[PDB]
Amino acid sequence: PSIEEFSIVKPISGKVYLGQKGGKLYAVKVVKKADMLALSKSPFIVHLYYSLQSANNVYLVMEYLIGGDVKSLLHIYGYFDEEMAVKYISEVALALDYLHRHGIIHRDLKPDNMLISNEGHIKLTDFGLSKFCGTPDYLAPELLLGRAHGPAVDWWALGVCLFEFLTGIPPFNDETPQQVFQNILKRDIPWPEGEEKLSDNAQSAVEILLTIDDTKRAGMKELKRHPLFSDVDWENLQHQTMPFIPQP
Ligand SMILES: [Cl-]
């Protein structure tokens, strides 16, 4: 496995490039060696292939997902209806539980980091393969206060993503980041009113996921037994049909 055997096609976007070998496409993220392994094979995690290290740079070869991220798809859709948001949130929750069972706290969950499989499924990344800094829309209250802080933070972020999937804008999103920090520490959740109202089960899930109390917050077991996820076949989730499929 040589690094020069990857014809760099297009830059994806701390930089990722679309490389090519024998017809196969790959997402190669570059990390400068100044900053600076273990395989995690899971249906809801971006599969990593190689970790080639050249002169003064380290290269990460991962599978290429043409579906993009969930933030862009959310901007196209404006917002997801309930069943799409619950499917996506379910898959992200299985990824989170797989990550916690391996001793990993994702610490940076957001729609930017959720990639879309060719069959419509969700794969997480930027959890240890790649990673204070704004935006603080997805940080838990215990993160702002500078305290410890365990894996429950990953679920708080989930409660944000859920809300963001259902309404369109994140709940604690506001003008300046200080105002956002206030909205988080005060837990001012701008519930939609009128005909755009959230269902009681959705409101319950967003409430139990966004609890200020670290030890009273929701986890994998809480969502499993939650009325919003009672239609979820957890033991066989990577074979459900997804509302959006990327092509070509
Ligand atoms: Cl968990």
Numbering used by the authors: 30 to 42, 47 to 69, 85 to 179, 738 to 854
Sentences from the paper on this structure:
Although highly related at the amino acid sequence level to the N- and C-terminal kinase lobes of the MAST kinases (microtubule-associated serine/threonine kinase; MAST1, 2, 3 and 4) and other AGC kinases, GWL has a highly unusual architecture, with an ~500 amino acid insertion between the DFG and APE motifs of the activation segment connecting the N- and C-terminal lobes (NCMR; non-conserved middle region). We therefore excised the NCMR of hGWL and replaced it with four amino acids 496 - RTFC - 499 taken from human PKCα, to generate the expression construct ‘hGWL-KinDom’ (see Experimental Section). The structure was determined by molecular replacement, and refined at a resolution of 3.1Å. As expected, STU occupies the nucleotide-binding pocket, making hydrogen bonds to the backbone carbonyl and nitrogen of hinge residues Glu111 and Leu113, via its lactam nitrogen (N6) and oxygen (O6) groups, respectively (nomenclature as described in). It is also ‘sandwiched’ on both sides, by several hydrophobic residues, including Ile41, Val49, Ala60 and Leu163 from the N-lobe, and Thr173 and Leu163 from the C-lobe. In electron density maps, we can observe amino acids 825-854 of the GWL C-terminal extension, containing both the C-lobe anchor (CLA) and the majority of the C-lobe tether (CLT) motifs (bottom).
Negative regulation of PP2A/B55 by GWL thus results in a positive feedback loop that boosts CDK1 activity above the threshold required for mitotic entry.
